[PDB]
């Protein structure tokens, strides 16, 4: 199963050995971390809109449920 396991475990070791150096290059320059990105602490629940820093991902088809869970009035990349 070198056909199977070895060319899969090489994916297992390589993504880790990349991931070690990236966290090392965070800790290598503690000078000016101005380009850490956080989406700028949008609203969570309450009147406390400035709450905690977030991130963004996107989804696709398969089981079109209805919707009351959202936050906004179907906007886009709302820059204004």
């Amino acid at each position: 199963e070198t056909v199977e396991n070895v060319s899969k475990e090489s994916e297992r070791i390589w993504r880790l050995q990349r991931a070690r150096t990236i966290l090392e290059f965070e800790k290598m320059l503690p000078e000016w971390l101005r380009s850490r990105f956080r989406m700028g602490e949008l609203c969570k629940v309450a009147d406390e809109d400035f709450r905690l820093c977030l991130r963004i991902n996107e989804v696709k088809w398969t089981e079109w449920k209805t919707h009351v869970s959202f936050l906004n009035e179907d906007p886009g990349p709302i820059r204004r």
Binding site: W64, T66, H67, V68, E73, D74, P75, G76
Partner: protein, 112 residues
């Protein structure tokens, strides 16, 4: 007071309190009666419509959804039918640049 009415109803439609909207429509005809006979479309299409996005109460009624929608829409339609404002009302569009054409029917089928 005297400015809350635009801010009240947009929230009041979102909550779905039916009889509270009946109190909101009660004074709303009186504000038209305070006018001297002014154009009921060209007045209520500034009251039912937000000043910047062009969003009506009706598209606001269909963005949010609760089990009170089937009654909250017809009352906003019957009040739009008892004042000869219906044809301008149901075919309202966004004035806003990002959404020129998100009408009341596209937002209906979106919520399925």
């Amino acid at each position: 007071k005297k400015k809350r009415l635009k801010k009240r109803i947009f929230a009041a439609v979102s909550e779905g309190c039916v009889e509270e909207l009946r109190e909101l429509l009660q004074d709303l005809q009186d504000l038209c009666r305070r006018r001297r006979g002014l154009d009921v479309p060209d007045f209520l299409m500034h009251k039912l419509t937000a000043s910047d996005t062009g969003k009506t109460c009706l598209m606001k009624a269909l963005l949010n959804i609760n089990p009170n929608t089937k009654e909250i829409v017809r009352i906003l339609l019957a009040f739009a039918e008892e004042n000869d404002i219906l044809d301008r009302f149901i075919n309202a569009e966004y004035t806003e640049e990002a959404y020129e054409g998100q009408t009341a029917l596209n937002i209906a089928i979106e919520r399925r």
